[PDB]
Assembly symmetry: D2
């Protein structure tokens, strides 16, 4: 049965910023979710200004993978919902965090670090080099993805060392970035993917959308729900 994916987007820039609305008139979430649906996923969206930011228990309980984009309103996501999502990831829900989502409460909580970085908005070139060429996330991608204009993020990226580094970006201005990183938290699989500044049509680039689709598939839950913790009796005789 199709993997069920919820694409969550702060959905502030596209309402109010002319240059962004021109690129994403129905929001970045609509673009990503449309692509995913046309790729066979059961795709829905959620935004910050819906009740419970669209992430009710009912929604999350039928969500296999959550995709997250935020930027200027990270602080408005309520702690109750962050905790709810955190619990679901640890139980096995997948999480794909995009671009400025590195500063989301949920990603910072999972990482345990500041998730800070260097950055510059200069309409500069990015080339995302594949460094895990057999990884399912890079199926169909070529040796790199090139973006003619993006916002630079630069090392040092204050994240725990990834389980795997999939992409490393080169930027025109001299920096590099670990731009595709996987992590596992509990049963959940997380993929950080750097591209997607709101003022560039990055989410219309077919290789970008394909990485996201590939990542949704890679992140799907396997044994969602079942771990026993706590006080336990012995499985073998203990000798006095």
């Amino acid at each position: 049965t199709p993997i069920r994916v919820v694409v969550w987007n702060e959905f502030r820039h596209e309402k109010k910023d002319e240059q962004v609305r021109a690129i994403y008139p129905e929001g970045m979430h609509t673009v990503i979710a449309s692509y995913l649906a046309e790729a066979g996923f059961d795709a829905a969206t959620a935004v910050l200004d819906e009740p419970e930011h669209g992430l009710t228990d009912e929604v999350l309980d039928r969500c296999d993978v959550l995709v997250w984009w935020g930027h200027i309103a990270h602080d408005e996501v309520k702690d109750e919902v962050v905790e709810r999502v955190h619990r679901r990831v640890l139980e096995g829900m997948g999480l794909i965090v995009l671009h400025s989502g590195h500063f989301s409460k949920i990603f910072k909580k999972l990482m345990g670090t500041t998730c800070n970085l260097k950055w510059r908005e200069a309409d500069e070139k990015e080339r995302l080099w594949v460094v895990a060429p057999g990884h399912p996330i890079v199926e169909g991608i070529g040796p790199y993805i090139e973006l003619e204009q993006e916002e630079m993020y630069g090392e040092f990226f204050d994240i725990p060392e990834p389980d795997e580094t999939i992409f490393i970006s080169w930027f025109e201005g001299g920096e590099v970035f670990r731009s595709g990183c996987t992590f596992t938290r509990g049963k959940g699989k997380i993929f950080y993917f750097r591209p997607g500044h709101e003022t560039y049509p990055t989410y219309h680039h077919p290789d970008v959308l394909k990485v996201i689709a590939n990542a949704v598939r890679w992140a799907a839950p396997v044994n969602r729900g079942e771990i026993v913790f706590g006080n336990v009796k012995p499985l073998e005789p203990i000798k006095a």
Copy 2:
């Protein structure tokens, strides 16, 4: 020149349980700090009931490596202080988390997971096998450390995958545990080391103490201090 170490202990059990007090009449912190002093470290102690839990900015700014044990009052450590310690580890302070410190606010914050596990107090044998035989933390340690009595902890331990697993424990009752794990968070080096239940003389065991001393040296800051993040000018010209 000597590495400065603060040994933090909740110090509630040793006052409320006579069986504990008999083993550690001046608390576990005193035993650990005394050994570290004799090993050549500049060692101090701090406990929960001191003001700021003993961890003022003044104390933390002169602390190279913090050692942490807690159990029954993890909740009483104020968030302001957890946040202060978290900042210090990211800037390069070392952290050694011991035994029940797996449920400390600070370790859970740095891990991003629940750090739950299975457990049992049945005075059973533990054998900590070395699985990183060339690691500095196991200098002078044989193939395993054997403790005649300890509290079992058992996988699955809900932690991010370690940078390195140093020890894996075998318990008499059937369980195993990744009982010595290293992580890096920011510039800080963390070592989780399982043994140390308050009802057993585990911190009188010479190999246990040697591991802690080896870990204090390993975890000593390099390049300690603020990392530069934020908006930056290009090092190469960007075609406009």
Copy 3:
């Protein structure tokens, strides 16, 4: 298209030893391949005492995942064949190494270490604890797999640190072992799975066969073939 898997087995013990033949009268390869065929894989088998050990170019070129079991005749696998296999794994072919396969020429070549370990044949109990509970390899597996009789292998196991540790074994006799380990080499995915001594019906255990099937699915290539190396022209202008 179903995944094409070749199950390679030394196939000496099952002819030499009456007690082994009684358990695996047509070889362990036949039992594993039959299960895989029932699970929907396009399964074939190959054995040491065949021209090219059954691993001709034509066979390997259509092999998506190779499963390897050997023990008493690792030396007899011709270097030309080991090299052929090694090239295929780096191009993306999956490799599942079973039990005494740890000392196969192919596994040692891919690892770079001796792959030696401690061992004991004493019909003792082994409990394989899952330590990556979200990993695809453990789909359908409970917290542990228990085998009533197996040969002990024990740490230190001289392997490079795995990409992920999936299983850690507890043995009745006191030892532990990293019993399911993943590695990536080139584009190829490798899984080492410890259980499988010839004198015990381990490959009739449903959980064991399930893990192998899950690992074959996991290890199948999705970007298969030649990577570009060598001298390359610049993508950006270089100032003279």
Copy 4:
């Protein structure tokens, strides 16, 4: 006791090419070893055209860390010597592989991959960004090292995923590289460090030499010696 380091260098280019001899008149090994002696190490050199290539059992037994640079005569290192070195690394001798040492027999043997990569000799700028800012290898190193001219190596670099990535290089021509990588093999610690082309004064750069010195200290053996393997008696009773 100072750490004993042997700097091994093929030493063909500096004898045959006047452009190279002008930069390194007494060989690249001399320059590195002289720095290391001033940094307090007990340093010695060895070269290809000495008996046993300078790497007798006697020499290797008193070597704590071996540094290796080769390029046009990797094939002339005798397999007997490669094997000797390999055994010593597994027992805990450190190994620092420099630049075209990526294609040395010893590095390839420890890695289990081809170690191939993309490359270009175009006198282009390289900026080595630190991505493990607390690591001992980068003590005293700024956010990056910049080399005005170097040979480009580019991803994909066919190595096993490093234990840690210390540096990632940006090159003027558009590529990136994992340019400082640690690995553990047996007891031995290995650091690959990219810079070092023979036609550029790279080993006269203070930060490059500092990194090497730091890596020599980091790679010093602990618990050096034969690991015990083989058949072992049980530590606990095994039931009939």
